[PDB]
Amino acid sequence: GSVIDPSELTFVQEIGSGGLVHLGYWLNKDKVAIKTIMSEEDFIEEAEVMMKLSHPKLVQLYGVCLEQAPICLVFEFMEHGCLSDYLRTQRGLFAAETLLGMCLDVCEGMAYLEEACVIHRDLAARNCLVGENQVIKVSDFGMTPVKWASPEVFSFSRYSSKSDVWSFGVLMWEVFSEGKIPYENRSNSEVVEDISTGFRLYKPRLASTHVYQIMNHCWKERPEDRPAFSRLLRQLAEIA
Ligand SMILES: CCC(O)(CC)c1ccc2c(-c3ccc(OC)cc3)c(-c3n[nH]c4ccsc34)[nH]c2c1
Numbered sequence: 165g166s167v168i169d170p171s172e173l174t175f176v177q178e179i180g181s182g183g184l185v186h187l188g189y190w191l192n193k194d195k196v197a198i199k200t201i202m203s204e205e206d207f208i209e210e211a212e213v214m215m216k217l218s219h220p221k222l223v224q225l226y227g228v229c230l231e232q233a234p235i236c237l238v239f240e241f242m243e244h245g246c247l248s249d250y251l252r253t254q255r256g257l258f259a260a261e262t263l264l265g266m267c268l269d270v271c272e273g274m275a276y277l278e279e280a281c282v283i284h285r286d287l288a289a290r291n292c293l294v295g296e297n298q299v300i301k302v303s304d305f306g307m308t309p310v311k312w313a314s315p316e317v318f319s320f321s322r323y324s325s326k327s328d329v330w331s332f333g334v335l336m337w338e339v340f341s342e343g344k345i346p347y348e349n350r351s352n353s354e355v356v357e358d359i360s361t362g363f364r365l366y367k368p369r370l371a372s373t374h375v376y377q378i379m380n381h382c383w384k385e386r387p388e389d390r391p392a393f394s395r396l397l398r399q400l401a402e403i404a
Contacts (some may be wrong), residue, residue: 165212166227168238173198173229179245187241190226195241201234206308211237213306217280221273223293223303242301244294251289251343258342260370261404262298266339268400269300274332275393277305278325285323287331288312289338310355311346316387318356326387329396333382334365340375341368374403 174189175198186198201207211228218224226238244250247266251258270292277284284291284305291304314330316322334346346365347355364383367376378399384390391399 165208166215166225167231168227168229170229170232173236173238190238194226196226197239197241198229198236199239200236204235207235207237209308210304210306213282213308217277217282217305219273219276221269221299221301222276222305223301239303242293242295244298246290246303247292247294247300248289248338248343250294251339255342258370260372263339263342263370264375264400264404266298266300267336268397268404270302270332270335271393271397271400273302273305274328275397277302278328278393281325283323283325284328284331286312287328287335289335289343292335310352314387315359315385322387324387325393326390329382329387329390329393332393332396333379336375336379336382337365337368337371340371342370344368372403378403 168190172191173196174192175186176189177187179185179187179197184200186200188196188198190196208228208230211225214223215225223242224240226240229236229238274284274287282305284302285307286304287302288309291302293301293303295301310318312331312334314327317327317330337346338344347358350358364380371379378396381391382396
């Protein structure tokens with residue numbers, strides 16, 4: 165399943181930690197994001213799933229480097245790193261249209277995963293990447309915090325594409341607030357209690373009445389009342 169020899173990789177600079185990430189080169193040519201190692205088998209399987217899902221708004225892999233421990237996944241290099249950090253560093257420089265376009269990119273990737281019956285389970289701005297011309301790609305979509313979890317997920321672990329829709333609503337909030345922490349300084353028990361009473365994340369300044377309505381549609385108590393990613397995509401496109 166696309167095996168890369170360790171000698172083919174050149175480690176240049178550490179760029180992140182989660183799962184350690186390095187900026188590097190494969191075959192002294194392509195810029196790569198090397199993600200060094202959860203069990204070894206699950207780490208390989210996540211890449212195998214991702215390598216068979218081709219969409220312009222989903223991150224791509226060059227291959228997997230096994231044989232020598234710690235094992236690593238060889239991803240394409242994304243120029244502007246993770247979406248969460250990009251929003252925080254470029255805060256105050258974003259236009260409303262740019263933020264909506266970011267949500268539309270994520271929604272496109274999510275609509276593809278929804279049709280392929282692939283549940284992300286951890287959709288958040290920290291799991292999204294920024295490339296050339298501010299193109300957003302969904303990352304870590306091959307897996308098998310409660311702040312992004314739907315009520316049926318944090319209470320009954322009922323994962324579905326509709327639970328990813330709730331997570332997308334929180335992602336939409338992260339984007340429009342320019343990288344703000346959802347339910348800041350609040351514990352896991354506190355967020356569960358708030359959401360159960362009917363509390364929802366506040367409307368950020370850059371998000372219009374229509375954008376906030378879409379966020380609240382993603383945040384409906386019952387998963388059946390939430391719109392599918394295929395529907396959400398056209399709703400977001402209509403606001404633009
Ligand atoms: C914006 C500053 C800079 O340009 C500095 C070289 C940069 C910084 C971080 C990244 C990452 C990246 C590294 C670790 C991350 O945490 C998982 C998320 C993103 C990535 C990245 N690109 N592609 C992939 C795949 C998994 S993480 C990652 N590119 C980065 C680029």
